[PDB]
């Protein structure tokens, strides 16, 4: 059968609620941190620790 067999299976989405929640939280934290760091680089900033 394999020589002439054709089987179509769609890509399987993750079925875990925990993994989806972790992915959304991790992406949000990384992007918000990147935006704050970029703004600090391009803007005047005050440091809690001297010369930091």
């Amino acid at each position: 059968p394999h020589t002439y067999i054709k089987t179509p299976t769609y890509r399987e989405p993750v079925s875990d609620y925990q993994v989806l929640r972790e992915k959304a939280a991790s992406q949000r934290r990384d992007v918000e941190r990147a935006l704050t760091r970029f703004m600090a680089k391009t803007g005047e900033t005050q440091s809690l620790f001297k010369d930091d």
Binding site: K6, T7, P8, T9, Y10
Partner: protein, 133 residues
């Protein structure tokens, strides 16, 4: 506007068949390895699974370089010979991946004791030189 998920061109049953052939090719059972070689030679449908087969051999070879596996290397060469003999697949297109793997096997240092594996080492070099030519 999500598009429908793309599906791999190879049939899932054909991919399962490729997985079974690779498991037979590992050489754990001599009869399974011989059957896998015969199946590759007589199967026109096996064509188009050659990029996956070539990548599997390359991944096995690179791990084999880190710790010498001369018996496993000989089994990988047997799989390479079976792929080359089959007419339907285009060996030349995926030949570029195969040539470094054969060259490393011929010049690889033997991690295992040289006298115990000397017969296998001579066979491994002989198999590599024939496929390279």
């Amino acid at each position: 506007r999500l598009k429908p998920r793309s599906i791999h061109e190879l049939s899932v049953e054909q991919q399962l068949y490729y997985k079974e052939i690779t498991e037979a090719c590992v050489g754990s059972c001599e009869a399974k390895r011989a059957e896998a070689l015969q199946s590759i030679a007589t199967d026109p449908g096996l064509y188009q699974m050659l990029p996956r087969f070539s990548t599997f051999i390359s991944e096995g070879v690179r791990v084999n370089v880190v710790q010498n596996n001369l018996a496993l290397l000989i089994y990988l060469m047997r799989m390479v010979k079976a792929l080359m003999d089959n007419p339907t697949l285009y060996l030349e297109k995926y030949v570029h991946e195969l040539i470094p793997a054969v060259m490393t096997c011929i010049v690889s240092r033997q991690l295992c004791l040289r006298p115990d594996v000397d017969n296998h080492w001579a066979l491994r070099d002989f198999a590599a030189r024939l496929v390279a030519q």
